[model samples]
Target chain A: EIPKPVAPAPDILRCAYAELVVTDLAKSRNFYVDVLGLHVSYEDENQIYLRSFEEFIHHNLVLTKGPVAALKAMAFRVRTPEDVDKAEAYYQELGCRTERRKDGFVKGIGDALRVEDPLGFPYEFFFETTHVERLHMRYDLYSAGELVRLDHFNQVTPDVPRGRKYLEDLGFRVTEDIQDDEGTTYAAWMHRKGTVNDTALTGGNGPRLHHVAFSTHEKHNIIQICDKMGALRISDRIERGPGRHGVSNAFYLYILDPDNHRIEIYTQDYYTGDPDNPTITWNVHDNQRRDWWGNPVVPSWYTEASKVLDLDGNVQEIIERTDDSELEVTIGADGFSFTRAGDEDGSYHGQASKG
Target chain B: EIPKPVAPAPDILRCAYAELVVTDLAKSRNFYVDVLGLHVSYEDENQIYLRSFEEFIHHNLVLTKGPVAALKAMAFRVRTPEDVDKAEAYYQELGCRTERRKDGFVKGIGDALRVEDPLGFPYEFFFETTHVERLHMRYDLYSAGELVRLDHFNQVTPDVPRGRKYLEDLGFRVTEDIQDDEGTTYAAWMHRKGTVNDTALTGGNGPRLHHVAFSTHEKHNIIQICDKMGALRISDRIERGPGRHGVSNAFYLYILDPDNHRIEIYTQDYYTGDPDNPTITWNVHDNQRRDWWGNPVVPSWYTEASKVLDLDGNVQEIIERTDDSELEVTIGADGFSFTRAGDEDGSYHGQASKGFKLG
Candidate 1:
């Protein structure tokens, strides 16, 4: 077994922001800022910087115009400037592809370290960014489904243990997981903050992006987006879920942005701050294990994923899962997923057009 | 000035539950349990007890069948058993009708104190309750709106000042309120818990219930209630809101159950736990001050309320508001509310229905 990294690994503050390449900056900006209500940090002709009403950071989402939609980087903020250097040394020691960008790759951010980790997803670490007035008090400007902060990223990787080990080595604690009685770690949710996850390693072909999530202050904020989508005549973009997820016990809704990239509006996951916080495990076969309300998972959410970029901002090569895939094992792509155990009498067809 | 209670005031835990008398328990149960997803504590023929997923207490709502829809009691839980005695002395010292029952008036509750305050609303206080399994982790059973806990109560009273003063003497502190520049108190939100309110006093007829609010952990949960209502073909029952309120800064929705008794799904009010928390006073004329989004309030929300019960379980007498009514002052007989300031420009209208699948 490869050695675990040093104790008190490079301290990550939280999932700070994402640089997403959108096909149409205007359309994506409208969806994020106008209807979804993310606060505009700053904008140029080529890019639009956005943050949530509750953020003090310069931006939580950076929408840049591109021919194709993809994630530039899933960025994390380290505790201090030296922590960025520490991350470089750590990733370098692992013999990973890495680069040091002095002035930073994105606007408003300072010195940074970019890495293509063992999993091949581009990661950026920085401690310094411009601070703006936190919009927490500005109820006057809050839009429906007022997103407060960029909460976490769900990444697809074939090797669940490999992803969990790397994140754990990087100082993230596993908050929850889906596994069988025989101890197959199908997926692991890891976090640095008080929330259940800052990142979730979902089982699928890798190093693709499953979805990136932002938190709303209340559940209605999420439904407000759905209502607006319905009003806009684009309800089909709602990929899956406006239901409770059993894994986090959080109220949730998922929608595909204009790029067909998935975005999850999450709320109300419990605190996982204790040193000895109990890790929750769900049996992969249980229907309620995914959606607490037993809503079936959309096949699209299982099969579809956004391509991630390498340090050169090019699409990373895809890898297949050799281990048992949760979707194939449970739902099997036969349009089959049960709400209960046993040979179920077709209680709920997974894609039954949930309200 | 009338003397405030001199002895130490009663210690309140939170807005524990509301016992509502419904004409049809089945419909009420479906609304609370099926639509709202409040966890079922227990249920039987006459009454159905429900609690939010995060609750440790036996129930947050008690729906009992009655001849007509009414509020049985706006209940609060005290921190200790002695607090019930404190409540008894506190109300009686003010010359109000009071009763103490060693046996709880409701199942799962213990020793209790019931009172008709100077405002004529039936209030109950109790400390001991049977512990129900907290389903905070049981996401598998959550519903769409997923009403989690009883947040607060709102009562329609002619005199907001009188009710606010009495609640202040009972250890509640005002968080946010509505008032005219001339100090005509339109409403006062008072609280004992960290939430913006345990109860609110609205300027209206005496002894009427404005609404009983249950909290969803997030705002989307409240809108899910509306979405389910819309899908269930009961969108007409969505009386008002899925909008931000200027009062508590909470994400709110108001829906009427089958009996037209008002129910509010509330969420995301800021913490007002400090003793010296600054009171937010809204100018009664500001249109956005009511709903931060500028959604106009339906006239019925300002006018209609359920009758409250007395100690004898009889409908309490309603008294007219002698002061200027907010509905009459704002919308008047024409039933119009402005979304912006200034007269006659037709720049803003409040009657815009929120549910259109507009192209």
Candidate 2:
């Protein structure tokens, strides 16, 4: 059974910044700043801060030089500064390791607290931050694949049902999920900002960072990302998509950073702000669940993820997943099938690459 | 001086259709229907009538087989069936050939009048058309490059000033144009449907059809047109663009039909509804005037156009342009330049194609 703490969870406003440790800061900087068109807010020899076009906060992402490519922390902006205190007590009640910093763990943020939560994921909560110019209408400065805002993060956890319950107690509501007829939940998308999602829990190994996503204005902007990547001879870095996702009904493109961290450029998902917003559940057998065009999801997308670090900067011990993998369940020895598993036209399975 | 007819021009609703004669109906059908995903409302051995996704009209385009590849008529939907009579009288006053029929020249239309206008191009006016089911919400039938509606048409005439006056007299407002310091006008965009244009008049060899444009929802839809064309191994048909046009502030892609008629997939131009809307005139030397990204325009785009036919189905006589050619003036013996005429950094001239077809 998943542990339930007596202390109430703090109100998370939204997924804010994700801290990533890269081996080569310059290469990582070129990938984010030049290739992806993310604006550099602040940079140093040790780290670089980046923000999207519509962001007023100091950074939506941070790249720090490190020995290994790993995720340091996935940060959330809480409702209030006191919610940082609520975060500390909330994790402490569950006997999880918690740390509070008056000046924040990074620059441009204040009154923060870090916790290695029940799932062994490094999570941070903060309320104060520096404000920067929101370059919303700076079309002259815009690139072809201009990223508008940071959208959400996807985490690979061993048990999505347990992981989703913890997020729900913290006020995130489920917008969509993927499950089998046998009652095995494969993934769950939960949101705080009234869009599709703030975080998605994908069933896999424990406490791994799946991908961080940013939003574009239109589907063309996502295609531009692929075009520029091809022009730069980095088309191999394009892992998946420039296609619509059947789950959220949004267009998406996924690319790998220099350090192998996955970044998704997304757009055009419907809103789900109502109290009784219907939770859309897709069957695991549906081929269009991941891609609306019925394109096969890359196996690496299912098998690969970034390592998560603890507050002490040590790699967290990963827990093995006991649940059925969505990949193995959806795809079998007879190849892929949709709608029903035993369909005869399942021989169309093969590698489909954007590159 | 451009003659202003005493009789007022009929109130045109919008650009309705352009009837084209193709050598092979199969090749033309595959280009517009299978590749571009235009819905075929009606088809037979001789002709194919097509409509876009959001269209209620029976057809926005008609492809009929003929000996020579040419344009038959550029039609406009008038406000009323009486306007067809108004159209006949309006052109008759100018001594142009006019023909009226209770049954239209094609199926799915009624009470039409055809005229070889003062400019020597076949023009038609009709207010009655058969209404089909509007498949606006049928996303399942939508292709990657789903065209929403028929946007506009473009005509090539030797004298733009004379053509502009003729159109202005017919109540079409000029939204944009291209000109130089010596006041040589290159082209003009005019509108009646409250968007950027219903028809644009280009400075070129006389009395020809430049292109017909269709609008998509977003820029990706235009790019999808290129992708599908490439997939079909017909990327050579993608003649120009998948680029933003500085002229209209719209994203556009130009493709060639089997008959070499140009079809533009376009999206996202600002509305020009106000009576006092500013007429944006670009310099003849501004490279971005055609392509916002400063890409060089292909030579054939300026020099070539479909021959226009008269009401009698005979190709009209062509008139050579007296004014300086836009291609020759902008792209000099030295090379091409933007923003100004004498810039040295104009060496980036060549063919850019969707098939990776050009330099």
Candidate 3:
């Protein structure tokens, strides 16, 4: 069944930036700059901020080298100055300690509130940030070969519904979702406007990052990077892709940013601007859901993820669902299915959704 | 400078296969099968052999899940049965211990030799293996997404020029190379037909693996995987790409394998079958060498690589390059430059490459 599109919240914009804590500044900087090919917008001894080709902001991949590399924090942009205060009060009332900063962490941004979410994720809310001119004009002179802006981020959380509600209350909307026959296993995509934002949240135990994605202008640019890597004899570091997906209607390639944090170069997701974009649902049996055409999820994508640590530096435990046994199934080898766009049994039939 | 074309080497074919070690059979099997989306050609309690969308082999991703997840070995396909013996003798002359195994390790028919290279890389040379029927008959099903075949692998060695000479002497041709003006840094791509083999053996102290790559049929297949990952809310696992590169002439993505071993999905490289396919050489200053169209190489691709442990399970020390001061330069915030492809040099124009040649 096609999802009935809903209007986005009035004041929401898009994901503005993310803050990362890296163990080695130089190494992370090289990973974000030389390897991933992000532009170094600004930098100091303590922090180095980067931006994608399409971004007009100060940075996309922010690096603060520390004793260890971890996802230290993240931020989202709202429409007006008042919304920042709204988020601060809303989260503060929920028992989170909120603090407002004026000068802004990055150079161009104006004001923001830094707080820790109930699930133990660090976040910030800000508005009135200045926009730089889109840098796509320099597409020709680039030597390190970077593409467009930061796209989306995935987060692993204990409750998908709660995370959805929290972001929705803060103006996020669901574009698509995945659920099994029993409705036990659930995950959803939420966005702002120009680009897909922090993937709202997925059902798991602890709150940690999955990976962050950016955009590329075209498909040929991806190939160009691979060829250059091969010419440099660094082709061995290429992990996966140049493959398509039936889900996002986008092209992709995933590479490891120096700390093993994944960075996806993605493009061409269908427009989510419309009020009636269908909230597509996928079944466990849908082959197209895993790989719209047919590919399987790699084992590393499932098991090789970086673990989240608590405030005291202990690995956090996630609560697994007891009702559905499907969560325990193997990824690529095990056969499964999902609902395509307009399937009758609440399952997608491998057809593209006409949102 | 642009490179001139080089003559094709005789008796070369595409990349054959690579072998990886894993800690758990069931877990690794599930990962390759369930997560990464490779099709299982065969499986048992000890190992699971897999293939990408375009292959006709018994397997492409072989998982011998056991004690540890490390690069245990590699295999290359030769033209004739005599080539196996030839390799054995050649390696033996090189002071390597070569052994011939007749029954085969996994399945199908084969004559093979296991040899230890001087740098400690383990490789098996084999011929006489039967070919699985190319399932090209199912393109429609495949376009729907059953990746076949094994593609290429990257090996990190302390001495690149020495390794390049050894592989070249063994009949592998250098297709592309990168060098700086100071003549301090060097990296080369050697291939046998459809496959890109071990590369960029930079001069240093020890050898390690950088990453491994696979090939898919269409560009959309790559996107499909990423989209599903998003639908699954696992989008964070996506590391890079959907962009073009100036290097391999192929579309690409790099994903972290289950053990954090880097797995590359790549396609559309320039044709190596042509007699005059260019053996491109790139100067270090040619920003496009790291990524054609000039994207920056991610830091993880450089520093967050798999480590090589001695037989005693101790991590080996990577010898740092001293003469090449450029290798010592700090990248990122402390340094000013562009990371994304198609962007202006933000502050300092980063290092530029000299010139490129096909020979």
The candidate maximizing DockQ is: 1
Leading candidate by lDDT: 2
- Model 3 lDDT per residue over A1-355, tens place: 1121232322656766777767778877766666556777779998897887767766666777666556666777777888887777676667766667887765667787777676667676778666766766552223323567677887776567667777766567788776765665556788878343456565555566767777776775666565555644555556666667555767777666667776666777777777676777766565565455555555455443444444333444555533333234423324333444345553323232221
Residue-wise C-alpha lDDT for candidate 2, range A1-355, written one tens digit per residue: 4466677778898999999999999999999987788998999999999999889999999999999889999999999888898898889888889999899898899889999988888999999999998877554355557799999999999999898888888789999999988899999999998999999999999789999999998887788788677767788999998889999999999999988999999999988889789999998777878998788788899999999999889898888899888877766443344644567453244323122
Off by over 4 Å in 2: A1-355, B334-336, B340-359
Task: Encode model 2's per-residue lDDT on B67-154: one tens digit a residue.
Answer: 9999998989999878888888888888889999898999998989998887888888999999999988654355557799999999
Q: Model 3: runs farther than 4 Å from truth?
A: A1-355, B1-12, B139-146, B194-205, B307-359
- True-vs-predicted CA distance for residue B213, candidate 1, Å: 1.0
lDDT, candidate 3, equals: 0.61
> Among the candidates, what TM-score does chain A have in each?
0.94, 0.95, 0.82
What CAPRI grade goes to candidate 1?
A: incorrect
TM-score (all chains, Cα) for each model: 0.56, 0.55, 0.46
Error of 3 at B323 (Å): 6.3
Provide the RMSD of all predictions against the true structure, rounded to 1 decimal: 10.6, 19.6, 20.1
What TM-score does chain B of candidate 1 reach? 0.93
Window of ten residues with lowest summed lDDT in model 2 chain A: A346-355
Interface RMSD of 3: 13.4
In order of DockQ, best first, we have 1, 2, 3
lDDT of 3 at A288: 63
Q: List runs of model 1 lying over 4 Å from the truth.
A: A1-355, B333-359
Candidate 3 reference-contact recovery: 0.00
| Candidate 1 TM-score restricted to chain A | 0.94
